[PDB]
Short mmCIF file of C-alpha atoms in Angstrom, two decimals:
data_model
loop_
_atom_site.label_atom_id
_atom_site.label_comp_id
_atom_site.label_asym_id
_atom_site.label_seq_id
_atom_site.Cartn_x
_atom_site.Cartn_y
_atom_site.Cartn_z
CA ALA A 1 12.79 13.48 -9.52
CA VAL A 2 10.49 11.21 -7.11
CA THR A 3 12.09 12.31 -3.75
CA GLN A 4 10.88 13.68 0.15
CA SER A 5 11.32 14.74 3.17
CA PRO A 6 15.53 13.90 3.19
CA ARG A 7 15.26 14.58 6.80
CA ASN A 8 14.08 11.98 9.94
CA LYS A 9 12.74 13.24 13.08
CA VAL A 10 9.69 11.34 15.48
CA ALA A 11 6.33 13.44 16.44
CA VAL A 12 4.43 13.59 19.26
CA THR A 13 0.77 13.82 20.18
CA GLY A 14 0.22 16.41 17.78
CA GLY A 15 3.74 17.08 17.73
CA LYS A 16 4.43 18.23 13.49
CA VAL A 17 4.91 16.50 9.93
CA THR A 18 7.26 18.11 7.85
CA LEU A 19 7.56 16.10 4.62
CA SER A 20 8.95 18.08 1.22
CA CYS A 21 8.56 16.01 -1.88
CA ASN A 22 9.39 16.50 -5.53
CA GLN A 23 8.09 15.35 -8.87
CA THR A 24 10.63 14.95 -12.40
CA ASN A 25 11.44 11.44 -13.47
CA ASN A 26 9.24 11.68 -16.73
CA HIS A 27 5.57 11.37 -14.93
CA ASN A 28 2.04 12.19 -15.87
CA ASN A 29 0.66 10.65 -12.41
CA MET A 30 2.43 11.16 -8.70
CA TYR A 31 -0.08 9.50 -6.49
CA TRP A 32 0.88 9.89 -1.87
CA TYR A 33 0.76 6.84 -0.33
CA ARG A 34 1.37 5.77 3.54
CA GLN A 35 2.09 2.46 5.13
CA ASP A 36 -0.57 1.94 7.49
CA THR A 37 -1.05 -1.85 8.50
CA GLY A 38 -4.98 -3.21 8.97
CA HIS A 39 -5.46 -2.55 5.19
CA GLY A 40 -1.22 -2.43 4.53
CA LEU A 41 -1.39 0.77 2.04
CA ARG A 42 -2.90 4.54 3.01
CA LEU A 43 -4.16 6.24 0.13
CA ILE A 44 -4.10 10.41 1.58
CA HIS A 45 -2.98 12.57 -2.03
CA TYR A 46 -3.07 12.35 -5.88
CA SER A 47 -1.76 15.07 -7.44
CA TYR A 48 -0.85 14.21 -11.66
CA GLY A 49 -1.16 17.86 -13.18
CA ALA A 50 0.45 20.33 -10.55
CA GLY A 51 -3.12 21.67 -8.02
CA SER A 52 -4.14 18.45 -7.00
CA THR A 53 -3.30 16.50 -3.88
CA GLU A 54 -6.23 15.81 -1.59
CA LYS A 55 -8.52 13.13 -2.95
CA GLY A 56 -6.88 9.53 -0.98
CA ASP A 57 -8.73 7.64 1.00
CA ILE A 58 -9.71 9.50 4.27
CA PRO A 59 -7.81 12.75 4.62
CA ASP A 60 -7.80 14.74 7.48
CA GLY A 61 -5.70 16.40 10.33
CA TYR A 62 -2.58 16.91 7.64
CA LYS A 63 -2.12 19.74 5.05
CA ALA A 64 -0.86 19.72 1.90
CA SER A 65 0.31 21.69 -1.41
CA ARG A 66 1.29 22.02 -5.59
CA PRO A 67 2.40 25.29 -7.08
CA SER A 68 4.46 23.81 -9.16
CA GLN A 69 3.43 20.42 -10.60
CA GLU A 70 7.52 19.65 -9.80
CA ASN A 71 7.23 20.66 -6.39
CA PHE A 72 5.47 19.82 -2.99
CA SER A 73 4.80 19.92 0.28
CA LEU A 74 2.88 18.79 2.63
CA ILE A 75 2.59 18.70 6.84
CA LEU A 76 0.69 17.56 9.57
CA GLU A 77 0.44 19.36 13.71
CA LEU A 78 -2.50 17.08 15.38
CA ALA A 79 -1.22 12.90 14.76
CA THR A 80 -2.90 10.11 17.22
CA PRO A 81 -1.02 7.67 18.65
CA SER A 82 -2.50 5.18 16.12
CA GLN A 83 -2.47 7.03 12.76
CA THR A 84 1.42 8.59 11.68
CA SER A 85 3.02 6.05 9.45
CA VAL A 86 5.65 5.70 6.83
CA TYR A 87 4.93 8.72 4.10
CA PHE A 88 6.03 7.47 0.58
CA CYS A 89 5.99 9.32 -2.35
CA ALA A 90 5.10 7.61 -5.59
CA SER A 91 4.72 8.61 -8.95
CA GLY A 92 4.23 6.69 -12.53
CA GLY A 93 3.37 7.27 -15.59
CA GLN A 94 -0.10 6.13 -17.39
CA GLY A 95 -0.52 2.57 -18.73
CA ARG A 96 2.33 -0.35 -17.41
CA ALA A 97 4.60 1.07 -14.28
CA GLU A 98 6.55 0.92 -11.60
CA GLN A 99 5.49 3.14 -9.07
CA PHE A 100 8.90 5.48 -8.52
CA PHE A 101 9.20 5.39 -4.74
CA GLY A 102 11.57 7.78 -3.38
CA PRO A 103 13.43 8.26 -0.19
CA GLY A 104 9.88 8.60 1.57
CA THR A 105 10.37 9.77 5.35
CA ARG A 106 8.88 7.47 8.63
CA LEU A 107 7.87 9.40 11.81
CA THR A 108 5.60 8.26 15.05
CA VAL A 109 3.19 10.83 17.64
CA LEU A 110 3.58 9.32 20.17
CA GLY A 111 3.20 5.46 21.20
CA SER A 112 6.09 2.49 21.91
CA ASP A 113 5.13 -1.15 22.42
CA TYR A 114 7.27 -1.78 24.50
CA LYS A 115 5.78 -4.27 27.68
CA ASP A 116 2.51 -4.33 27.43
CA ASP A 117 1.96 -7.83 27.50
CA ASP A 118 -0.20 -7.79 30.56
CA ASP A 119 -2.42 -4.29 29.73
CA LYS A 120 -5.46 -3.75 28.43
CA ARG A 121 -5.13 -3.12 24.11
CA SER A 122 -8.08 -0.23 24.84
CA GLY A 123 -7.00 3.63 26.92
CA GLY A 124 -10.14 4.81 28.23
CA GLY A 125 -8.40 7.79 28.41
CA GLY A 126 -9.40 10.55 25.82
CA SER A 127 -7.35 10.87 22.10
CA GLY A 128 -10.64 10.60 20.32
CA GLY A 129 -12.30 6.38 21.52
CA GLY A 130 -14.22 6.14 18.61
CA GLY A 131 -17.12 8.46 18.78
CA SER A 132 -18.59 9.40 15.78
CA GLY A 133 -18.38 7.56 12.72
CA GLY A 134 -17.75 3.86 13.53
CA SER A 135 -18.05 2.16 10.01
CA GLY A 136 -17.33 3.51 6.69
CA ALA A 137 -16.06 3.55 3.13
CA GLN A 138 -16.54 0.09 1.48
CA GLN A 139 -14.30 -2.27 0.35
CA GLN A 140 -13.89 -4.15 -3.64
CA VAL A 141 -10.84 -6.05 -2.75
CA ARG A 142 -10.42 -8.88 -0.46
CA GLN A 143 -7.23 -10.97 -0.04
CA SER A 144 -7.63 -13.90 2.01
CA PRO A 145 -6.68 -11.97 5.31
CA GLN A 146 -5.12 -14.20 8.09
CA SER A 147 -1.09 -13.85 7.04
CA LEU A 148 0.64 -17.02 7.97
CA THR A 149 4.20 -17.93 7.87
CA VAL A 150 5.78 -21.46 5.82
CA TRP A 151 9.15 -23.00 7.30
CA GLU A 152 11.88 -21.98 5.01
CA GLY A 153 11.75 -19.86 1.67
CA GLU A 154 8.98 -23.18 0.32
CA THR A 155 6.21 -21.98 -2.65
CA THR A 156 2.28 -20.56 -1.51
CA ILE A 157 -0.45 -19.93 -2.82
CA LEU A 158 -2.74 -15.74 -2.72
CA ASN A 159 -6.13 -15.01 -3.14
CA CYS A 160 -7.61 -11.71 -3.93
CA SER A 161 -11.52 -10.38 -4.53
CA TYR A 162 -13.78 -6.97 -6.36
CA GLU A 163 -16.66 -6.46 -6.23
CA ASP A 164 -16.08 -3.81 -9.02
CA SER A 165 -18.01 -4.27 -12.54
CA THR A 166 -15.38 -2.24 -14.67
CA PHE A 167 -11.65 -3.53 -13.88
CA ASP A 168 -9.89 -4.07 -16.21
CA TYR A 169 -6.48 -5.13 -14.45
CA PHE A 170 -4.66 -5.50 -10.29
CA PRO A 171 -0.96 -4.53 -10.84
CA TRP A 172 0.12 -7.24 -8.09
CA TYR A 173 2.81 -5.58 -5.58
CA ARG A 174 3.15 -3.80 -2.64
CA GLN A 175 6.90 -4.15 -0.93
CA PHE A 176 9.67 -6.95 -0.10
CA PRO A 177 12.17 -5.58 1.88
CA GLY A 178 10.04 -3.46 4.18
CA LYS A 179 10.44 0.57 2.60
CA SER A 180 11.07 -0.22 -0.50
CA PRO A 181 7.54 -1.04 -2.60
CA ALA A 182 8.13 -1.45 -5.43
CA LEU A 183 6.19 -2.73 -8.79
CA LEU A 184 5.69 -6.45 -10.27
CA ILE A 185 3.56 -7.65 -12.76
CA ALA A 186 -0.35 -7.61 -13.45
CA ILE A 187 -2.87 -10.06 -14.44
CA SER A 188 -5.72 -9.97 -16.38
CA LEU A 189 -8.65 -12.33 -15.87
CA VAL A 190 -9.17 -12.92 -19.72
CA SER A 191 -7.00 -16.27 -20.24
CA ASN A 192 -7.44 -17.82 -16.92
CA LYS A 193 -4.88 -18.76 -16.62
CA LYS A 194 -1.46 -16.30 -16.69
CA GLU A 195 2.93 -16.65 -15.87
CA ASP A 196 4.97 -13.61 -15.16
CA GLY A 197 8.77 -14.68 -13.73
CA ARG A 198 8.04 -17.89 -11.95
CA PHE A 199 4.43 -17.78 -10.71
CA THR A 200 1.58 -18.50 -12.15
CA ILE A 201 -3.04 -16.81 -11.65
CA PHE A 202 -5.83 -19.02 -11.78
CA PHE A 203 -9.70 -18.14 -12.68
CA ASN A 204 -11.63 -19.46 -9.67
CA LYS A 205 -15.74 -19.06 -11.35
CA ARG A 206 -17.13 -20.57 -8.12
CA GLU A 207 -15.86 -18.73 -6.29
CA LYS A 208 -15.15 -15.54 -8.39
CA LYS A 209 -12.39 -14.44 -6.79
CA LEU A 210 -8.84 -14.26 -7.82
CA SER A 211 -5.93 -17.26 -7.35
CA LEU A 212 -2.50 -17.87 -7.91
CA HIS A 213 1.28 -19.84 -7.33
CA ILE A 214 4.36 -17.99 -5.57
CA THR A 215 7.51 -20.92 -5.89
CA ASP A 216 10.73 -20.27 -4.67
CA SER A 217 10.90 -17.55 -1.50
CA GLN A 218 13.78 -16.35 -0.06
CA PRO A 219 13.46 -15.27 4.42
CA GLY A 220 13.68 -11.82 5.51
CA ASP A 221 9.48 -12.19 6.28
CA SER A 222 9.03 -12.96 2.82
CA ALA A 223 7.52 -9.87 1.19
CA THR A 224 4.73 -8.49 1.53
CA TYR A 225 1.81 -8.49 -2.46
CA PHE A 226 -0.97 -6.92 -2.80
CA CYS A 227 -4.53 -7.08 -5.71
CA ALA A 228 -5.48 -3.89 -6.65
CA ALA A 229 -7.49 -2.73 -9.33
CA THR A 230 -7.64 0.28 -12.14
CA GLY A 231 -9.79 -0.92 -14.46
CA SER A 232 -10.75 3.01 -14.36
CA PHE A 233 -8.12 6.01 -14.57
CA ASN A 234 -6.23 7.15 -12.15
CA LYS A 235 -8.31 5.52 -9.13
CA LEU A 236 -5.86 2.28 -7.21
CA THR A 237 -8.63 0.22 -5.51
CA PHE A 238 -6.01 -2.07 -2.52
CA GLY A 239 -8.11 -4.29 0.20
CA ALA A 240 -4.96 -5.38 2.17
CA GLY A 241 -3.67 -8.39 0.60
CA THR A 242 -1.09 -10.98 2.84
CA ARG A 243 1.84 -10.76 4.10
CA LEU A 244 4.04 -14.35 3.71
CA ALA A 245 6.34 -14.91 6.36
CA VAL A 246 9.00 -17.05 7.39
CA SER A 247 9.57 -19.14 9.90
CA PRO A 248 12.46 -18.73 12.57
CA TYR A 249 13.55 -22.52 12.08
#
């Protein structure tokens, strides 16, 4: 079924990344994402009808192959101190299903951030450093940046935006614990107000954005929710949702 390299190991500057995922859980489409802040979800590989696994967002420095629609495998041989992350082999069906995330892998290439309090955040000594391709890739999903933590698991409000002209709905979901993403629900922006569980959504026309309310929350960094769209087929556009957190006191 949807699985990933059960092994666990780390790599160094251009070390190596061994990953192995399988597909056979009744899913007609297998998506591949990676936990990467800045934008949150990081699409890199795409496999749904076999012979397909290289059309995420900015695939580069990785090798993947899909000889069989059920068997898959990919690795890397040149990672940088800011590209590694946790590989998650997600696989769901079409229409409205939860991404059956399996035991993904987690490895980092070079890096530590243990005592970086009295040093500049720019190692000007090789290892890339800007270069060509400074900006690019447009953006549609715009979730209120600047995360925030509320006292205890109180309620909170979220905001999302979009610049597409053919979106159908936005499967509100991402991951609550830290290494186990999951689907929650899906809006549609057609009734101006909806409710699925204990939170409702609103349609802001004056600002063209989606705002919902979530009450009754629990500690543990609260949870991270993303707002992506999928009006098209095999194409989810996310814009780094928000990461709700709970205060220590």
